Swiss-Prot record:
Multifunctional protein which primarily functions within the aminoacyl-tRNA synthetase multienzyme complex, also known as multisynthetase complex. Within the complex it catalyzes the attachment of both L-glutamate and L-proline to their cognate tRNAs in a two-step reaction where the amino acid is first activated by ATP to form a covalent intermediate with AMP. Subsequently, the activated amino acid is transferred to the acceptor end of the cognate tRNA to form L-glutamyl-tRNA(Glu) and L-prolyl-tRNA(Pro). This is Bifunctional glutamate/proline--tRNA ligase. It comes from the Eukaryota. The WHEP-TRS domains are involved in RNA binding. Homodimer. Part of the aminoacyl-tRNA synthetase multienzyme complex, also know as multisynthetase complex, that is composed of the tRNA ligases for Arg (RARS1), Asp (DARS1), Gln (QARS1), Ile (IARS1), Leu (LARS1), Lys (KARS1), Met (MARS1) the bifunctional ligase for Glu and Pro (EPRS1) and the auxiliary subunits AIMP1/p43, AIMP2/p38 and EEF1E1/p18. Forms a linear complex that contains MARS1, EEF1E1, EPRS1 and AIMP2 that is at the core of the multisubunit complex. Interacts with TARS3. Interacts with DUS2L. Component of the GAIT complex which is composed of EPRS1, RPL13A and GAPDH. It is found in: Cytoplasm, Cytosol; Membrane. The chain holds residues 826 to 874 of 1511 of the full protein. It comes from Cricetulus griseus (Chinese hamster).
Length: 56
């Protein structure tokens, strides 16, 4: 339901790409989503599901 750092910057890029931002940052966020979620895995989603989640 709720996820800190993972959502924190996850939305940062979501809004950026929405309002037109650089792919470098948009993807970067996708990464923090995969990286942070893996660190998260508290006891809710396990590798929390943000949105972008991993990007090539």
């Amino acid at each position: 339901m709720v996820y800190d750092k993972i959502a924190a910057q996850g939305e940062v890029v979501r809004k950026l790409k929405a309002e037109k931002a650089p792919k470098a940052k948009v993807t970067e966020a996708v990464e923090c989503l995969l990286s942070l979620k893996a660190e998260y895995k508290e006891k809710t989603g396990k590798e929390y599901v943000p949105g972008l989640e991993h990007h090539h």
